[PDB]
Each structure stands twice: as C-alpha cells, then as structure tokens.
C-alpha cells in the first residue's frame, strides 16, 4: 500500500504541475486577447501587424 500510495502521489503531482504550467500559458493568451479586445474592438490601433 505504501508503494502504491507513493506512485499515485507522484503521478498526481506531475498532473498538477503540468496543469499549472498550462494555466500560465492560457493566462498569457487571455491577457493578449483582453488587450486585443480593448485596443482593436474599442478603438483604432496604429500598431503595425497588430
């Protein structure tokens, strides 16, 4: 039971760490999308290729 508990805890910790990294990436994309909604939809942008 100790062996199985250690293995399942290691796998679940790996899942939580991967979810945290993906959450950071998704938060960066959502910040970019919020900037685009504030600057393209609500105004006219002079930034090139934006």
């Amino acid at each position: 039971i100790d062996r199985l508990i250690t293995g399942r805890l290691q796998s679940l910790q790996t899942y939580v760490t991967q979810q945290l990294i993906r959450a950071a990436e998704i938060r960066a994309s959502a910040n970019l999308a919020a900037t685009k909604m504030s600057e393209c939809v609500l105004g006219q942008s002079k930034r090139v290729d934006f």
Partner: protein
C-alpha cells in the same frame, strides 16, 4: 539491461509523457523561430547600386 527494462515497464507511462513534453518543447522552439523571423512573403533584394 533487460532486467532493468522489465522493472521499468511496471511504472506505467512516465516516460511517454516525458517524451511528449520534450517533443512539445522541441516543436515550440521552431515555432518561435518561424514566427519571429518569417514575417515576409517574398525574399527581397537590393539593387546593384549601393
């Protein structure tokens, strides 16, 4: 070693997700280089007069 491989098979799929993570990083590096440098459609050239 065959005995180490037989014991490593019992741990499940840690190595598959490690390989998937490294493959994702290796694809993302080329995506970074392509999205930074390849922003031009045609390869321009300067005239022979300098």
């Amino acid at each position: 070693s065959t005995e180490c491989s037989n014991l490593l098979l019992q741990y499940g799929s840690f190595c598959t997700q490690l390989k998937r993570a490294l493959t994702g990083i290796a694809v993302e590096q080329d995506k970074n280089t392509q999205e930074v440098f390849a922003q031009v459609k045609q390869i321009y050239k300067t005239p022979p007069i300098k």
